[PDB]
Swiss-Prot record, chain B:
Primary gene name: 9
Full protein name: Tail spike protein
Cellular compartment(s): Virion
Species this chain originates from: Salmonella phage P22 (Bacteriophage P22)
Assembly and interaction partners: Homotrimer. Interacts with the host O-antigen lipopolysaccharides; this interaction induces cleavage of host O-antigen. Interacts with tail hub protein gp10; this interaction anchors 6 fibers onto the tail hub hexamer.
Region of the whole protein represented: 172 to 336 of 667
Domain-level remarks: The interdigitation of the polypeptide chains at the C-termini is important to protrimer formation in the folding pathway and to thermostability of the mature protein.
Disulfide feature: none
Family: Belongs to the P22likevirus tail fiber protein family.
Role noted for this protein: Structural component of the short non-contractile tail. The tail comprises six spikes that mediate primary attachment to the host cell lipopolysaccharides (LPS) and display endorhamnosidase enzymatic activity, hydrolyzing the alpha-1,3-O-glycosidic linkage between rhamnose and galactose of the O-antigen polysaccharide. Digestion of the LPS brings the capsid near the cell outer membrane.
UniProtKB/Swiss-Prot annotation, chain C:
Name of protein: Tail spike protein
Domain description: The interdigitation of the polypeptide chains at the C-termini is important to protrimer formation in the folding pathway and to thermostability of the mature protein.
Organism expressing this protein natively: Salmonella phage P22
Role played: Structural component of the short non-contractile tail. The tail comprises six spikes that mediate primary attachment to the host cell lipopolysaccharides (LPS) and display endorhamnosidase enzymatic activity, hydrolyzing the alpha-1,3-O-glycosidic linkage between rhamnose and galactose of the O-antigen polysaccharide. Digestion of the LPS brings the capsid near the cell outer membrane.
UniProt record similarity statement: Belongs to the P22likevirus tail fiber protein family.
Annotated localization: Virion
Domain of life where this protein originates: Viruses
Amino acid sequence: ANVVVSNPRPIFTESRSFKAVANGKIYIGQIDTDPVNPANQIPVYIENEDGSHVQITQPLIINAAGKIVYNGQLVKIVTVQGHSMAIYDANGSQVDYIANVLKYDPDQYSIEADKKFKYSVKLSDYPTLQDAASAAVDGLLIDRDYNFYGGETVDFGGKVLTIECK
Amino acid sequence: AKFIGDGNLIFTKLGKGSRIAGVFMESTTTPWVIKPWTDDNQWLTDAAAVVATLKQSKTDGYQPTVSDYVKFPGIETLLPPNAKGQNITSTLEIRECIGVEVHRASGLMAGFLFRGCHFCKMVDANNPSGGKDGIITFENLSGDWGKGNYVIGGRTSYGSVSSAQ
Amino acid sequence: AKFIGDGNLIFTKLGKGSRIAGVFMESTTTPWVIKPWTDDNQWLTDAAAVVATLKQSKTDGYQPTVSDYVKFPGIETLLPPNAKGQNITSTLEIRECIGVEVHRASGLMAGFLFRGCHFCKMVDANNPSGGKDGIITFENLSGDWGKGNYVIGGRTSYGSVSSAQFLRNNGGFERDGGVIGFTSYRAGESGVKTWQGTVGSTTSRNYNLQFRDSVVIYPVWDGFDLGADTDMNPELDRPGDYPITQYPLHQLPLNHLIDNLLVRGALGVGFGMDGKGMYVSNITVEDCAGSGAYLLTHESVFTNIAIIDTNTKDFQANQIYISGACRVNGL
């Protein structure tokens, strides 16, 4: 859509020189508070595009490309809330502090799309009402005509359905 | 979310099975309303007493009617010309349609109307406060004559004219 | 899907036009119920016979009420401790919201309590079974006086208390609130009840409600209790109400709109009310074990009254009783 990140691939550099942060640490924690404190600091998860979340240690390691790395590979790190990011270099000096990091990006989109959307099947996407009946898990929509004969039975499988006929 | 404005908002040529639910109608301008009754729920038959209770409110009264001018003598002259005869009502219409049912009408200084409509009704309420325009009204005055046009359920309060017609 | 539990499931901060549809409420435990009726759906007036039908179920009876202990003498002692003092109801409470209308209310041992709410309706309730908490309960004791709290369409069944109960509801000059198009069955108090006098810290007395086209079948006491000034505050001050000096006991200007009411099957009195300046019309009370009406009203008019086949078990002494001086045109 219209949503895009500032850095197409996350990369962290020194404040007044364009050179990657080497052997840096990133502390991820609650918004508008220092993530240095363990109390504010939150656990970070690797978001697998499969639809799995696994838990890893709270600090993120910065390689020599200035990119996030965990388990010797480029990872996609997510949190369960809006977070603050604090970039620290190898001398432990604070390069940059970002109080607010929030994004809507649903990628994976197996787990996400169940919770953020409603489901109604349209009769136009099936050739028969029987197929659209078994494919209705919540909503059912009748947007076109259906022929029927004496003694034609349609089964919904015991599912509770809100049917809308237009 | 509220439908804010005054005068009709027409929806033309809708086919059968149209639904509208949870609608609220609010007027963007607060009109002057008269109250010819007391807090004992007894009429004020003195025309000066109705003018004394004249206020700008969107509830607890209804905008002046030509019928109140006859009922209470001299009320018309006493009322300001900008405080009487006004129509500031947030109104909705469905035009030349089939099967449109409006459910759970709310609002303050509100009204609903239909034109050219068949098979069209007002079901349920949140108890809306009526304005100058009728709360439930049917026309076929463009279109041709109705059928299936009914009202069941709900109720309304206030209005300056009939709340069903 | 259901909402299972006991106590109050509290919903807060729901905006205007919010709908709750298809709701079901079921208690986790199965409470004891008693059935004070036969298999022909009459009554059991013997205490031991009501105790004999004691079972754990959520239907075909309602939980032992305090009013049942007075109604059937010696029933309380016979009943076991576990079947008494019960508070087992699965209650969905809408607390301080406006425009929240509960559609298609069902459940077993269910209640819906609207606390501090205004312009919230019970719209087309489909066969719920009540509990200790009323099915339709408007509690405006907390918060300001209820207005716009209505029962429009639908029906109710069972309940150990009033199915439709109004606590501190003043419709004002509008005459908002009321019960229209309703059927109530086996309330442990009264099917449609405006509460008598001051109950609780603040007043529970009700004014300006509209009751038309309502049916109460088999109430324990009155089907329509439209009083508000019965047995409470005989003393000089009546809280949240006019003094007893200003208006004597059983007189208030409630100004309820009373037309087309039907009561059938009442064990006790079928109709009762108090007030002054009340105008009552089209009341038909028939086929009641107890009296048709006990009218505690004074200076009230009762028009087109039919009391036919009431007091057929002779608990009382008459088909109709009027304590005060009233004007009855037609009987």
